[PDB]
C-alpha cells in the first residue's frame with residue numbers, strides 16, 4: 812500500500828527526503844517513531860519523512876476535500892476565503908459525535924450574505940453514512956460523488 816504526501820516538505824537533516832504534495836512512497840520502517848523510513852517513487856531515494864505529512868493513497872485523509880481535525884469556525888474561515896465559489900465544501904470530523912462527520916458548504920441567501928451551512932453526517936450501526944433517510948453510503952467518497960450531481964435536499968450542489 813502506497814503512501815501520498817499531503818504537503819510539501821524540505822529535508823532538515825542529511826537522512827531526510829524532500830518532497831512535493833502528491834508524491835508517492837513505499838514505507839520501509841515505521842517502528843522507530845514519528846519519522847518513517849521511506850522510498851520515493853519519483854526519485855528511488857530512501858530516507859526519512861515526517862509521518863504526519865503522508866497518508867495511505869486510498870485513505871479519506873488523502874481526499875482534497877477532507878480536513879480531518881478542522882473545527883466548525885475554522886471550516887467557515889477556510890470556505891469563506893477569496894476565490895471559493897458557492898458550493899465549495901469540505902468534510903471534517905464531527906465536534907459533537909465521535910465517529911460522525913460534518914459537511915460544511917459555502918452558500919448565499921437574502922438574510923445572511925455569504926455564509927456556511929453545516930450538515931452532520933451520521934452512521935447507522937448496521938448501515939452506512941447518511942445526511943437524510945433517502946440514501947446511505949458505505950464510504951464518505953461515495954457520499955461526495957452522490958451529492959456532486961444534484962443537491963438532493965442540501966442548500967446547494969457540491970462543487971468538487
Ligand SMILES: [Cl-]
Pocket residue numbers: 817818819832
Ligand atoms: Cl503544501
Ligand SMILES: [Cl-]
Pocket residue numbers: 819820821822
Ligand atoms: Cl518544509
Ligand code: NA
Pocket residue numbers: 871872873874875876877878
Ligand atoms: Na485531505
